[PDB]
Design a protein around this ligand. Sequence first.
Ligand SMILES: Nc1nc2c(ncn2[C@H]2C[C@H](O)[C@@H](COP(=O)(O)OP(=O)(O)OP(=O)(O)O)O2)c(=O)[nH]1
Ligand SMILES: Nc1nc2c(ncn2[C@H]2C[C@H](O)[C@@H](COP(=O)(O)OP(=O)(O)OP(=O)(O)O)O2)c(=O)[nH]1
Ligand SMILES: Nc1ncnc2c1ncn2[C@@H]1O[C@H](COP(=O)(O)OP(=O)(O)O)[C@@H](O)[C@H]1O
Ligand SMILES: Nc1ncnc2c1ncn2[C@@H]1O[C@H](COP(=O)(O)OP(=O)(O)O)[C@@H](O)[C@H]1O
Ligand SMILES: [Mg+2]
Ligand SMILES: [Mg+2]
Lengths: 664, 664
Amino acid sequence: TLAARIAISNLHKQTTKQFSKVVEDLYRYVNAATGKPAPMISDDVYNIVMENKDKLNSAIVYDRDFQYSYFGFKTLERSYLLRINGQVAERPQHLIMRVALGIHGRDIEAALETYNLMSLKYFTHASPTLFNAGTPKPQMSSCFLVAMKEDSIEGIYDTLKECALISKTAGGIGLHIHNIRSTGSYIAGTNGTSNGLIPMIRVFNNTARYVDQGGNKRPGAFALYLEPWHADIFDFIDIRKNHGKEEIRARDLFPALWIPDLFMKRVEENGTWTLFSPTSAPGLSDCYGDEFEALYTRYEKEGRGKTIKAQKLWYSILEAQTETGTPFVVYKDACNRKSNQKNLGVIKSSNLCCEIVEYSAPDETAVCNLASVALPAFIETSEDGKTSTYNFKKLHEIAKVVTRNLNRVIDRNYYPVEEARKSNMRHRPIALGVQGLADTFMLLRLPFDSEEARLLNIQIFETIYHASMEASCELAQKDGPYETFQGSPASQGILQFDMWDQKPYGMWDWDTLRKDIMKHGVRNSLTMAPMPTASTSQILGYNECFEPVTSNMYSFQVVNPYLLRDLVDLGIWDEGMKQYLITQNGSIQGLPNVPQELKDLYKTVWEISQKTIINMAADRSVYIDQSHSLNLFLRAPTMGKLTSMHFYGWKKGLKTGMYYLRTQ
Amino acid sequence: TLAARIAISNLHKQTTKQFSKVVEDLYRYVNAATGKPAPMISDDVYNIVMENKDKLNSAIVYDRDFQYSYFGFKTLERSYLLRINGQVAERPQHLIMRVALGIHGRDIEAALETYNLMSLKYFTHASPTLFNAGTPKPQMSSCFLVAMKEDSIEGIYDTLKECALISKTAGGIGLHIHNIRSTGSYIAGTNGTSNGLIPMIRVFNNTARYVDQGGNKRPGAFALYLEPWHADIFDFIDIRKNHGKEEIRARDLFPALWIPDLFMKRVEENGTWTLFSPTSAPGLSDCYGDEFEALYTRYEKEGRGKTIKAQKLWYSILEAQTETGTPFVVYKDACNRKSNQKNLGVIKSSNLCCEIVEYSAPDETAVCNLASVALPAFIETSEDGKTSTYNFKKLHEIAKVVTRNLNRVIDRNYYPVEEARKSNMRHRPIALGVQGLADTFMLLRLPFDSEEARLLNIQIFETIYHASMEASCELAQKDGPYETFQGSPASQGILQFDMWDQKPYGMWDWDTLRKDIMKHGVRNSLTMAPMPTASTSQILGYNECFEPVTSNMYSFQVVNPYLLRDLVDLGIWDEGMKQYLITQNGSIQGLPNVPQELKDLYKTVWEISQKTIINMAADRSVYIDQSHSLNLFLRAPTMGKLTSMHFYGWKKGLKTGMYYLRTQ
Ligand SMILES: Nc1nc2c(ncn2[C@H]2C[C@H](O)[C@@H](COP(=O)(O)OP(=O)(O)OP(=O)(O)O)O2)c(=O)[nH]1
Ligand SMILES: Nc1nc2c(ncn2[C@H]2C[C@H](O)[C@@H](COP(=O)(O)OP(=O)(O)OP(=O)(O)O)O2)c(=O)[nH]1
Ligand SMILES: Nc1ncnc2c1ncn2[C@@H]1O[C@H](COP(=O)(O)OP(=O)(O)O)[C@@H](O)[C@H]1O
Ligand SMILES: Nc1ncnc2c1ncn2[C@@H]1O[C@H](COP(=O)(O)OP(=O)(O)O)[C@@H](O)[C@H]1O
Ligand SMILES: [Mg+2]
Ligand SMILES: [Mg+2]
């Protein structure tokens, strides 16, 4: 609370003020232990700063360093602000201006615009952008989707190298492994027999541990995608389990299910399910929908697999989720049917956090560059005091700024492997997200589950998607559409909500936009992918992404500042209320002297129906090009409860049915 | 004992007799589980057999299947004889003839010669030759020496792939890792910090576990070589330790020390030793001898490393050996100074079993193809009964046959990776070994430590080396010398014993041989590398390689048949003697009623001075081109005992100071 106007002030005392001078320092840096020149700013950005020192220097408002809260600034200090010899060299304002120049380069007016908006907290860029923008090999991308190159030792080891090379320069991996022959399958070259996915997973697991994002930075982070017909699927879903059989676990990796609809139909019908090695039943992962169902059903009748009860796999899935939070669940058919990248081929995975849905092949590794809008920044006390409104015009404007930022990032990015460069330059996807939906609903006096909250949510996502496609259409008018625009749904006038067979809310003129996209193209294949903001929401001091709060009281004790405000205002905030928060996980339901309106506004995620979560997720999904990282939260978790959650999500047409399952 | 004329007879009953028909069966084989045609004989050998059926068929003596003892035949049955559907398809005679044709091809007379000699047990070929000769991709090599390609994620992962590809098709790896920067070392590309050798070792460890020699055959087997100046050396030598700190161990790998003389001098002088990351002190592994000492000493004075007490490392080395049997010890300077491959560059490792000393680089992976001579087969009861002599003329003849076999193997071999093919075709090294030295000494009534045993040992190795270079000189007269002959010691008339500055024993005419080699060349850079024969001595029913017996009684109970013979002959073999063998680890020292001559002849390895072992090892070493796998055996192991063993070996000029240390 006070710690901000203390710990920040101490940083000011221990850091140089003048931006161009912190830049000189970073640039002229020499690694003392080896005597090697180790510039922390690229030649390009250094020269830009030198040729514009007065302007950039004078544009910076250091007062804005106090926009950051205690843990927010401590997050920046620990991992974001550049360091010289373990001592922090940058102030937050300097980080921001460095990022702004790293994205925009010689376009100083665009950089100044981005500096102001970010320092004023209208939006931020994902962690690797904050870390690396304007440094010598700026790897600003967060996401890589990697295709297992071939069912062969050569292809497995080439993929492993690729993952190592990507993991070296920060970034999470989603890796699909559907094509790897399962246990017991014949090996012709040596007349041997395969031990299947696990011993292969363990190699990748060790690589994730080894290659810690650049040398003592962060352990490698890989999600693995598998379709539930793969014969190794029972051991795959348990890769994170805590209990014995150590040689069969891979605890540093995350399992994710790439679920076809057929699996869900067989589960609800109480039918059979057939497990195949991909060698016995080829092509299953390279088709989807009815075409998949026809092929699967044929392979099944031809006796090419091993049949079991579907609900046997289901119960095992549900068990692993209860225990480990994993595996994730992403619906293959929804992803494929409702993707603007469908003209590229069949999409075979999502990513580490289940928000990216992009096409990947042995020669093309999908990449994404992310940023999130701070939704609370667009609340304005109305033209009379007392009432608060939402500035949708400003949000539209900011999302357009951010779209343009993320395009610049594509072009200014350093790619770890050639497969990433090829993919990104061809299709140019981007990922806009949000943070502080919860804060926004609170500030505006809208309970998460209210009809008003439901409407705001819809109109916020409509405007972000509309803004991003409008900006992307603008860029295509200047620079041409992305290489692979023609043949795409968008080229035919088919936008995300159309693929859900829905009319848009209509806060914006979609027909003019469609006419414009059909005529001129768009510069980006995809624009929307709301992400966890697990670090960046911490920096800006908002609740992560689009989830309700998990607790009105975290840990240093910190109480929901909107709730705190209310309590003192009602003359009820005392010691007796603080006690009923430290033990009560931070809940205010049932509490003696508390207005009903506060109980409705400050429900914990554990007190909101997951049916409401799914509904609002399905609502916003119609304006998400890609997917979003939907955690599900269950207090008293049972199979029938879990089951209804998955099936409700599935029948809503969600792409990401579940990220983590959070429990207790 | 009787089990042979039982279990073999049952095999006869369950297998087809006619060779060409077992061949047809193997060739026409279809993998039932996939319906894939899976021929177990190459087109080439199949056609050779078909065009020569009467001759090959009729050459085979199936009575010779009874040359194999109980565990000997069980070893063949379990892992060597080809199988159709888990049922054994080959008889031992068929395996032999297949091998003979796999090596010799269209030269039927050479194949028949090899069939007779092998079936009569004059020699055998290493396991992968027995497994793969005459199959479709015959990978007949046992040894690969792999260079870590570069101190970079790219080079580390390329090396890992290479090891995977080699491990796929059977064969042990020696991998040198001297060039990998140690813990804490700077990483420029990401401004990070290295975690050193261990987390990298763990990746290779997992690969060894994964890639089990062709799919459920044998776990991968890698030795890692490191020079003791590397800064990670304390954790490296403990990679096999049993106790806690699991993330720091690599239990499926074998550590080996590549020791420069300087280390040994500093240890005995009670001096200092400096640990370097190879980045701070480049080139140490790419020189040896005085040149190394000059460079090392300069880097040391320039303050480029971390100094400790040498005997601190020494005591740690000695500790790990006591506990784990490892690390192995191979002297870099001896290897390099006394190698015919010295014109190639500096040799940076030995191999899995410490017998191969061959040059390797990022583009050249050294390979070796091995065979062993059964030394007991050359004992002849002299021209009067009663006295036994040794047929050195026959040994010379057989070693010439074997030399020619191993050359053919070079040319007929399937290479797993291109680096192996390049190396082997350029330099063509080969490795002859021996088995049943112990049996030979017993049969002839020579105790292992006697002056007579000492002399036989010398003259046996002189004749094998002489024979092999004579045969290799012959091949160079037909086919030209190996590509890299010129510049080599041998090209200058310098043979192994010369590099020890010694005169040969002189049982053979070395001057005529030298004149011939200098004039015509030799076809092979190296010819001698006596190996463990850990499996193949089991097949032939002899004691492994050149070691004394470990026990006059193994496990089924089996007593030293030469000792048993003696006891019954002296009318002392009874129950009271069998009891003093089941408990006494199989020793006959001190025993009440046993002649002194038997006590001297049937000493266990645990009862022979390791000074005698080292002496006889140093004696034969003068006729070994490469090195040999010298296990050391210590009953009551202490630091001062271990220390004298290492230093005695070192001062003798041994290359392989120690393979395993065997203890208790
Ligand atoms: N555990 C284990 N798996 C192996 C081994 N060798 C190959 N595999 C696995 C990796 C792949 O999933 C699959 C096929 O491997 P490769 O394509 O490298 O085998 P190859 O071409 O010799 O035979 P193929 O025609 O593919 O059946 O088998 C091995 O030695 N051990
Ligand atoms: N633990 C860990 N080690 C790494 C990582 N990245 C590289 N290394 C190790 C592997 C090599 O021994 C050494 C150098 O690696 P690279 O050559 O791939 O690094 P780079 O070229 O970016 O920097 P450099 O010029 O070599 O210092 O550092 C990492 O992310 N984590
Ligand atoms: N530990 C991690 N290591 C590497 N990448 C990560 C990690 N956590 C998340 N990511 C990447 O960042 C993306 C968005 O995650 P998010 O939690 O919004 O990150 P941040 O807020 O730190 O930018 C994910 O899709 C994932 O690819
Ligand atoms: N478990 C193993 N896996 C792979 N290769 C091995 C293994 N054991 C030994 N080798 C290889 O065989 C060579 C000689 O070993 P040896 O014990 O004589 O084998 P064999 O008698 O089975 O032919 C060694 O130098 C090594 O490279
Ligand atoms: Mg293959
Ligand atoms: Mg490098």
